[PDB]
Amino acid sequence: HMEVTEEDIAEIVSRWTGIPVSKLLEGELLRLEEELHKRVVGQDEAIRAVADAIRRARAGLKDPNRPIGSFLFLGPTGVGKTELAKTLAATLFDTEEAMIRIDMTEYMEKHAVSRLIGAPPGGGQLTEAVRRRPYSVILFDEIEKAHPDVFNILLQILDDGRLTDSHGRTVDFRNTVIILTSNLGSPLILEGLQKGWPYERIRDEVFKVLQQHFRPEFLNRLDEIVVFRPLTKEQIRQIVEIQLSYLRARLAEKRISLELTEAAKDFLAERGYDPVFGARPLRRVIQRELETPLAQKILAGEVKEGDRVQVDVGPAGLVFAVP
């Protein structure tokens, strides 16, 4: 039957049950890694770890009273942790609105548990969010900064697959994916390399800090611990291309094409990435170095509807030409 699609029936069931369409159609998942890789460049280990856990859950091999998966993402800033969490949410649960982000720097000071689960009688940021979206990816950023009382609430999620809030009502976490992140150790490695420390010192100091913050009792609860890697030159270039996608689409409305030389791509990659911030700088590098001067060319009439635009490097920055 052709006229009524799989999506038609899935949408009916989804609206009646609250189960996301992609969840209902999970089986009609074996290429989850390739789907995640459409947005997340590299970090193959993280993608495989997440995909492996989801498969074990779908195959009926895990404890049904725990979340679908739980992970600790270690490694540096700006290399794909949040991008993977956002992409996973969009892929598993149809929208990035299915990602719930808890910034643990806002939960450091003792009375923060009431912020998480609701003030005691006489609601909570986490509990209310998960009640209204049981099918969600939950991202806890910078977990080592959480107050112990807040950290104990995370342990409850991992152990019981549920939380009781301050109203006394149980909040179901069994359909969530829990992603915990920390950059712990990464600034220390940068400090050692700047100071000229030998690798042995750097290594030993990273392990003692990890030992201090992350104990086996905690870590044993997790599906996997994954250390994100710094990005290679080729990976940063692929990220530049992904980050030009929306610009190209907007330009294509006026039939304008952009053709970047390899040097122009390398210009953006060089400025858009560093060890401290990862690829966090790239968006505003593209805005400043490409979009702004392109805007001036369009407004001046030098770049017109229908033009193919060559983008190359000059010593003042990127330069433009229409052949």
Which residue, 112 or 143, is less far from ligand ACP as judged by CB? 143
Q: Per CB under 6 A, does 91 bind ligand ACP? A: no
Note whether 26 and 64 are within 8 A (CB): no
Binding characters for ligand ACP, 174-203, by CB under 6 A (x = yes): ------------------------------
Least distance from ligand ACP to the Cβ atom of residue 73, Å = 8
Q: Per CB under 6 A, does 35 bind ligand ACP? A: no
Question: Binding site annotation covers 137?
Answer: no
Least distance from ligand ACP to the Cβ atom of residue 104, Å = 11
Residue nearest to ligand ACP (CB): 80
Question: Binding site annotation covers 81?
Answer: yes
Least distance from ligand ACP to the Cβ atom of residue 168, Å = 34
Cα–Cα distance for residue pair 261/232, rounded to 1 Å: 19
Q: Which stretch binds ligand ACP (CB under 6 A): 81-89, 151-159, 215-223, 311-319?
A: 81-89
18 membership: H or E segment, kind and range = none
Give every strand in the sheet of 308-314, ordered side by side: 257-260, 308-314, 317-321
Number of H helices, E strands in the chain: 15, 10
Q: Which of residues 42-61 bind ligand ACP (CB under 6 A)?
A: 42-43
Binding characters for ligand ACP, 101-120, by CB under 6 A (x = yes): --------------------
Q: Which stretch binds ligand ACP (CB under 6 A): 4-12, 52-60, 90-98, 276-284?
A: 276-284
Least distance from ligand ACP to the Cβ atom of residue 93, Å = 18
Binding characters for ligand ACP, 131-170, by CB under 6 A (x = yes): ----------x-----------------------------
Q: Which stretch binds ligand ACP (CB under 6 A): 4-12, 130-138, 163-171, 235-243?
A: 235-243
Query: How far apart are the two ends of the chain, measured CA to CA in Å?
Result: 50
Q: Report the candidate in 42, 28, 150, 149 with the shortest Cα–Cα distance to residue 87.
A: 42
Q: Quick one: DSSP state of residue 288?
A: I
Which residues in the chain precede a discontinuity of more than 2.5 Å between C and N?
28, 122
Tell me the backbone φ, ψ of residue 221, rounded to 5 degrees: -75, -15
Question: Binding site annotation covers 120?
Answer: no
Least distance from ligand ACP to the Cβ atom of residue 107, Å = 15
Number of residues that bind ligand ACP (CB under 6 A): 19
Among 78, 118, 161, 185, interactor with ligand ACP by CB under 6 A: 78
Q: Per CB under 6 A, does 79 bind ligand ACP? A: yes
Q: Which of residues 285-304 bind ligand ACP (CB under 6 A)?
A: none
Q: Per CB under 6 A, does 81 bind ligand ACP? A: yes
Among 278, 290, 313, 318, interactor with ligand ACP by CB under 6 A: 278
Q: Interhelix angle for 262-272 vs 233-252, to 10°?
A: 110
C-alpha 323, offset from chain centre:
40
Cα–Cα distance for residue pair 310/145, rounded to 1 Å: 48
Q: Per CB under 6 A, does 89 bind ligand ACP? A: no
Angle at CA of residue 195, ends 194 and 197, nearest 5°: 110
E strands in the chain: 69-74, 99-103, 137-141, 162-164, 170-172, 177-181, 224-227, 257-260, 308-314, 317-321
Q: How many other β-carbons are positioned within 10 Å of the β-carbon of residue 6?
A: 11
Cα–Cα distance for residue pair 121/276, rounded to 1 Å: 44
Applying CB under 6 A, which residues contact ligand ACP?
A: 40-43, 77-83, 141, 239, 242-243, 278-280, 282
